[PDB]
């Protein structure tokens, strides 16, 4: 075992492969499938396996009443192998946790689950399955990270997380972390943004976080840091709006784009200089649809003008969150880092009329070679049995 | 690890012994298993898989509704060791795809797997699980693979895709692939041919494959070539017509066979010399029953005379695809390539009155050891609960 | 690896201790869990197997009908881990079979799966999951074999199989086979003699088998022999009888004991000398109950006295099948070969109202150390919803 | 592989940080989960597990009746990944129990299961799955024993076992155990004293056992001892009475406090010195809710105050047993041996209205980082369908 350098550049890429489909909730109308949601993918230099946050119950059993809830003491972060139903069969366990994060240093995995009280909640650091760290609320209102992998480069793993109001300025903390053990942490000096869920990446030996503004901002703030945590901040200025809700694209800002700002939708952007990959939904008001939009002057230009778009799921069809992965030249034997993104295919509750609330996912892996756009929906017939 | 060489002769063989049957029909009245069609079998130098394409349910289940039909977003390739049911707590996720096919080069498996729209679908290529390649519709019109094994020789492996119309002339090529990366390929020039599902496999470094004629032909089309992708075409004379539907034994022709030549039914055979292994169904009409027929000089002459036959699944029993895979010396021990074959046992629509369509399987290996005839049908009694 | 000696003796035992119970009927009345019969444990140096003739069919689903019948195209030779219930999720397969015999050289598994019509049956031998040899019915009157575990000294193995009638003369057949290959055999001139379902293991290089007269004997005839197929034959001399059905214990013959004498259960006795341990059902009339009797002259004396009874299964509870398997040296690290045994719980029918037959299985070993009798029955309630 | 050397100090702790949680109960009304009571935490230098006593039946399902029964011939020790629920499709068999203790020295697992009649139980030693001693009742009174994991030092793995009344002066014997075979025993003389179910761990080089007085005691008996079993005894000192049921809080003993001493639950505690962790339910009368109490003197004196406490399940929760289990150093990398405990959820009879008694558990580790307490209890809503 080698740790991960994380020192080569993101690979170019002109669009998007179709890498899993795992039809979690066509399958778990029989199965036995764990209700989810928060899914992310994440790889060691040998697989790629999905985590995610069960509800401790399965779908279409009375236990998944009441699943819209987010925070419980029986959601635990579980991972499976990529594009196999999450079963109790299939899952490795993990932590218990209703927020999370995970990544491989190229040794072993780094799991975060955080779990306690509203206003003390703690997240418990594993490296290998062992505790490793704790680290407790610092605002006692909601202590809550990603909801996917957290970024290595040369044994250090790096995550960001949030304390205070989803509706307000709250306080943000980057986070170092060697071999499970948290070596340094410094909080963002950002007044006036807002960051949650923070999809992070590695990229020449920094770490580049695209986020959600929950509070006033319907573009997504970024935040980029070296691995001594001299970090940058800044919003996507493109006008090619990338927050669901959100309003019709027109000129954007640099900074928070007001319009429709308030709520949100973990997502994902990939940074490539002046330019941008945004994943985003299609609808601008509701968890509908995907799309990836190539804008090659979105990063630092307000325009709404761009020159690709990718359908990968369609407008009248549900989505939900969505992330970043990557491929380290460690397993593919590559020059460069490869982007991939993952999509949570939200069923249930609130825009269906069930008693739960679950997911399914897809994933797609950026090449240079010929791709195409279709749509990839989740596919399940509902409302279900139990319902 | 060490490629396979592919550089021996094929085993002769006087007969088939029956090597799997995974009732999966049977077991998925109760247990969880997928509704599935297109199966394989495909051996690395350790152990032999069964590949299918899932339709994103269980049987049993509602979302088994409408799998007559043959492309969506929702089926994927999937693998589970031979034998076995496919199920979601023993299967490995392979690729996204309504058309497919893999192989082991003895270091690695390639998979190819075929999704989106039909008038731009794109073939994903992974080698261990990482994709590789990928390649477009040329013709926009359903881009399409062998739903059987690639073939190795010597770190490369080989397939054949179409793409075009079923009912008519449509443009056929053939890849070399060296890790899954696309190295050569070049375009069948066989006007008034027809290849469709190509059955492929390496003897004394050379891919032969034995194909479906959709368009006009109730025998087989032909298919062979070196690495350096030399090929030549022709059509299996016997007048042992090896196509469903065909007419009933007569002169044959080296060339397509019009009549009852529309339509067809994946299939395969083996090439000795002038001689030829048969696979084929009972029924001259219908998908049902399966024999092996050892023709000495079916493979160039057109008599319809042939040495034995051995029976595989009744006449009034339903069958279904079949193809050819073998097992290499760096798996047996033996001085030759073992040929086997496997079966696909369809049930549902359109021949029974169910909302689904699935299949089990069957397989046998060749032998020059004592062997016997037999019916080993599907043994499900359909319809089921939730028809 | 290298391959087991199996020159060692047996080790002496003064009471057997319980060694696994998989509870497989009570489990399948909800989850799914293989219809089985005619299971057997066999182990490799590091793990023990349950080996089991599927029906195709899962516990509580239709497909379970009829299963009472012993033979047809759908039943497969599977195995899993001692004490697990063989489900689909955790069975490997192994054979397509209607009778059939595994046992581990020391380097590979050996199975031997028959199948095919009455008339003409074929053993498929594999190697390693790899076919390796077939043979074919000599008499034309179903080929069977053991039902349990063959037996391996210094890498050779060793089985038998009966062909012709199973209520008169039949013939029966010793094989020697080396990587999957027979290399000897010989018939053994047995007039008089009946033998099937033979329980064969290893002692001084040398293999004993004891096994079922269902003919005309309610005592056990047995065959021992050397590695050059040089073989002896009688009948277990005791006056403890250790067939069912069978008399009430009386004075016993060296030959077939005519009372009582035609059908039969298939068992398992432990020679020591002139002394052995029986293992036998309780009832006379019935496949109930099960005891170990340990009678110090029991091979060749015919008396009816006895030193040791433990009992197993209760007389009131439904029993079965019983087969010997041991443990190798090379295994335990003991330098000795130990003695197990297994027992079949059969439940259904014919002796119970329900659609099928279907058992789960105890097994014990032998010890110096204390033991104690006691009742572990099967505990299943019947009959069951699909009844 | 190396053995343990158990010769470090237990960590200091100064909180428990959460480490798992199974949801069996809330998954069981679906999927396919064991009944199961007596569930323990046991690890290797690479994983941990969670090892239970089956009821040989399945949650929601009609053999689940009457598992308020402690013994049975259908009970069986198995075991699976820490935090994954007890299904026959991840579990594997370790013995036939209704008793059970386990540990693994660094080299192999030790399993140890009780079964038989009340009036002759034997103890059957595995390690490595093969049997390797047996120990049978010395009183003829349900021989019995840990129902946690045993405790290992430089080889030398150590239990408890007891014979005789619950409700009485019963015999109670120390074992030391290498490669699974009993090579020391001694009997406790321990006149007044009375141990069940003991919870032990090894710190420095020796073991201490906190353990259960069901006859007079409502604090908990402890046994020390060297590896040549050279003895300690006495109860813990504190007034923070550990049993359940128990007086309200007051000054304790040294020796059994009788008042509501009759009757217990197993539980654990962890000695610092003079000072002690204590494990608790929060009622006083009821297995309900739990607690961590670290009071700095609690070992050694007898006064009521202690300086921490940590909620674990509240209250109103069910709770049930709880044990140790430590991580060694050649898991974790520490200089110390990390203390961590588990808790049994016990849901259904006699407490519910329900056909079934089983539980679910929790588990924590000793950090000396930020902690917080909370409830994370069971989560099932009882009854069941079946009920
Ligand atoms: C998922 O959760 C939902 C929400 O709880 C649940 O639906 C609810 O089911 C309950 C039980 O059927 C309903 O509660 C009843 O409502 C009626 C009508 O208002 C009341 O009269 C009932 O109270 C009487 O009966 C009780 C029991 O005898 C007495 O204790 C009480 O004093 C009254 O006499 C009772 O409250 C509720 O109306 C629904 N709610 C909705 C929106 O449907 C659903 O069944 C759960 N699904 C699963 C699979 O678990
Ligand atoms: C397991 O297998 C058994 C044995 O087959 C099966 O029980 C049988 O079920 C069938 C279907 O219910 C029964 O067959 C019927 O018997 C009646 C009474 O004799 C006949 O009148 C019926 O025939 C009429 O209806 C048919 C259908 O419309 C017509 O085709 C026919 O011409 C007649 O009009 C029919 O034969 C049979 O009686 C039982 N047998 C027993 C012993 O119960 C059982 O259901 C199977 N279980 C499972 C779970 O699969
Ligand atoms: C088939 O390919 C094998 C594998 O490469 C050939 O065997 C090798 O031959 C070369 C050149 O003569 C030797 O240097 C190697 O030592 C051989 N390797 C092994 C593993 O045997 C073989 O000659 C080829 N052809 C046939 C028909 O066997
Ligand atoms: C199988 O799928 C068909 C096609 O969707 C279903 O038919 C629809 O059923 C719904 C509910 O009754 C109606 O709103 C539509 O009129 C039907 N559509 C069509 C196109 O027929 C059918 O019900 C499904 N069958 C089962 C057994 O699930
Ligand atoms: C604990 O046991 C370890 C393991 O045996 C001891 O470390 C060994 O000490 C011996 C004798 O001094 C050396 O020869 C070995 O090289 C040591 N082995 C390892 C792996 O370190 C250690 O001294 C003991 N005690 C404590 C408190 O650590
Ligand atoms: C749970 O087990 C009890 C005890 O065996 C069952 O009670 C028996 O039920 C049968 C069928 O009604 C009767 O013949 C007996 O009178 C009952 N015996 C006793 C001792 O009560 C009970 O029915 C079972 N309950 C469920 C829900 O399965
Ligand atoms: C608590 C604020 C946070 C970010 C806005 O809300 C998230 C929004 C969610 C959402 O918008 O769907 C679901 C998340 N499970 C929830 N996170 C937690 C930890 O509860
Ligand atoms: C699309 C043409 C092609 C070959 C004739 O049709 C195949 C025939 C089928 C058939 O005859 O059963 C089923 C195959 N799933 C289908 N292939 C695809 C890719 O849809
Ligand atoms: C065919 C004769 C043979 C030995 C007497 O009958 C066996 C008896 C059986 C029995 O007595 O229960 C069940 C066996 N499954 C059957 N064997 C086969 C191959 O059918
Ligand atoms: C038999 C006495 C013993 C300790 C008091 O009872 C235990 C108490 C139990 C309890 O208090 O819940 C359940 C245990 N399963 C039981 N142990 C056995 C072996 O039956
Ligand atoms: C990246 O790190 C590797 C691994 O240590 C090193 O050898 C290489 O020089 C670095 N430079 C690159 C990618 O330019
Ligand atoms: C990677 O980390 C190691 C360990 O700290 C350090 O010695 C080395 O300089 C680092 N390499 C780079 C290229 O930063
Ligand atoms: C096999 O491929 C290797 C690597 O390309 C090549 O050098 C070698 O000549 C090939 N062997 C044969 C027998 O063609
Ligand atoms: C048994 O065989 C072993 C392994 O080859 C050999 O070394 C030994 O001498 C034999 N003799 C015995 C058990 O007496
Ligand atoms: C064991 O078999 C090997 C291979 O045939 C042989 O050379 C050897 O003599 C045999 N050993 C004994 C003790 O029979
Ligand atoms: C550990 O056990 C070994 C083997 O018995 C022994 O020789 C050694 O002295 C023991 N070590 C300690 C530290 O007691
Ligand atoms: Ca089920
Ligand atoms: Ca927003
Ligand atoms: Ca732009
Ligand atoms: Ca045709
Ligand atoms: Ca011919
Ligand atoms: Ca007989
Ligand atoms: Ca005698
Ligand atoms: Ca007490
Ligand atoms: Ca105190």
């Given at each position: 075992s080698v740790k991960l350098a994380g020192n080569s550049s993101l690979c170019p890429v002109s669009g998007w492969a179709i890498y899993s489909k795992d039809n979690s909730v066509r399958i778990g109308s029989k199965g036995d499938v764990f209700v989810i949601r928060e899914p992310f993918i994440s790889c060691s230099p040998l697989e790629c396996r999905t985590f995610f946050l069960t509800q401790g119950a399965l779908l279409?059993?009375?236990?998944?009443?009441?699943?819209?809830?987010?925070?419980?003491?029986?959601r635990t972060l579980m991972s499976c192998p990529?594009?196999?139903?999450?079963?109790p069969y299939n899952s490795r366990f993990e932590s218990v946790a209703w927020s999370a994060s995970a990544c491989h240093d190229g040794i072993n995995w780094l799991t975060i689950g955080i779990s306690g009280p509203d206003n003390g909640a703690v997240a418990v650091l594993k490296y290998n399955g062992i505790i490793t760290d704790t680290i407790k609320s610092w605002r006692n209102n909601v202590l809550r990270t990603q909801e996917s992998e957290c970024a290595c480069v040369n044994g250090s793993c790096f995550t960001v997380m949030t304390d205070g109001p989803s509706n307000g300025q709250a306080s943000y903390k980057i986070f170092r972390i060697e071999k499970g053990k948290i070596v340094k942490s410094v909080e963002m000096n950002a007044p006036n943004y807002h960051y949650e869920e923070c999809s992070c990446y590695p990229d020449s030996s920094e770490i580049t976080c695209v986020c959600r503004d929950?509070?006033?901002?319907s573009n997504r703030p970024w935040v980029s840091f070296n691995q001594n945590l001299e970090y940058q901040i800044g919003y996507i200025?493109?006008?090619?709006?990338?927050?669901?809700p959100r309003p019709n694209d027109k000129t954007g800002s640099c900074?928070?784009?007001?319009?429709?700002?308030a709520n949100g939708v973990k997502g994902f952007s990939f940074k490539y200089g002046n330019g941008v990959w945004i994943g985003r939904t299609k609808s601008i008001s509701s968890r509908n649809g995907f799309e990836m939009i190539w804008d090659p002057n979105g990063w630092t230009g307000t325009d709404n003008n761009f020159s690709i778009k990718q359908d990968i799921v369609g407008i009248n069809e549900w989505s939900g969150y969505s992330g970043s992965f990557v491929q380290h030249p460690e397993l593919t034997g590559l020059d460069c880092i490869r982007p991939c993104f993952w999509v949570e295919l939200i069923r249930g509750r609130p825009k269906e009329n069930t008693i739960w609330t679950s997911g399914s996912s897809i994933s797609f892996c950026g090449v240079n070679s010929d791709t195409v756009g279709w749509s990839w929906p989740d596919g399940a017939e509902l409302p279900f049995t139990i319902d």
């Amino acid at each position: 075992s080698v740790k991960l350098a994380g020192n080569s550049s993101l690979c170019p890429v002109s669009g998007w492969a179709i890498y899993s489909k795992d039809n979690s909730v066509r399958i778990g109308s029989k199965g036995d499938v764990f209700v989810i949601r928060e899914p992310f993918i994440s790889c060691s230099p040998l697989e790629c396996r999905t985590f995610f946050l069960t509800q401790g119950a399965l779908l279409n059993d009375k236990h998944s009443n009441g699943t819209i809830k987010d925070r419980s003491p029986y959601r635990t972060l579980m991972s499976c192998p990529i594009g196999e139903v999450p079963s109790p069969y299939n899952s490795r366990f993990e932590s218990v946790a209703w927020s999370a994060s995970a990544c491989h240093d190229g040794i072993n995995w780094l799991t975060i689950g955080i779990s306690g009280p509203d206003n003390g909640a703690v997240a418990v650091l594993k490296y290998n399955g062992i505790i490793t760290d704790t680290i407790k609320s610092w605002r006692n209102n909601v202590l809550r990270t990603q909801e996917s992998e957290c970024a290595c480069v040369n044994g250090s793993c790096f995550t960001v997380m949030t304390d205070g109001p989803s509706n307000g300025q709250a306080s943000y903390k980057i986070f170092r972390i060697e071999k499970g053990k948290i070596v340094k942490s410094v909080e963002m000096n950002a007044p006036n943004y807002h960051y949650e869920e923070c999809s992070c990446y590695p990229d020449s030996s920094e770490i580049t976080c695209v986020c959600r503004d929950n509070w006033h901002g319907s573009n997504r703030p970024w935040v980029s840091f070296n691995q001594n945590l001299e970090y940058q901040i800044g919003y996507i200025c493109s006008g090619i709006f990338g927050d669901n809700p959100r309003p019709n694209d027109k000129t954007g800002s640099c900074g928070p784009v007001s319009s429709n700002g308030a709520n949100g939708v973990k997502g994902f952007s990939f940074k490539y200089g002046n330019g941008v990959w945004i994943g985003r939904t299609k609808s601008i008001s509701s968890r509908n649809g995907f799309e990836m939009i190539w804008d090659p002057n979105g990063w630092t230009g307000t325009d709404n003008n761009f020159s690709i778009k990718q359908d990968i799921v369609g407008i009248n069809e549900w989505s939900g969150y969505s992330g970043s992965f990557v491929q380290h030249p460690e397993l593919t034997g590559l020059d460069c880092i490869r982007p991939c993104f993952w999509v949570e295919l939200i069923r249930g509750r609130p825009k269906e009329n069930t008693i739960w609330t679950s997911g399914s996912s897809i994933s797609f892996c950026g090449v240079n070679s010929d791709t195409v756009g279709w749509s990839w929906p989740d596919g399940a017939e509902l409302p279900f049995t139990i319902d």
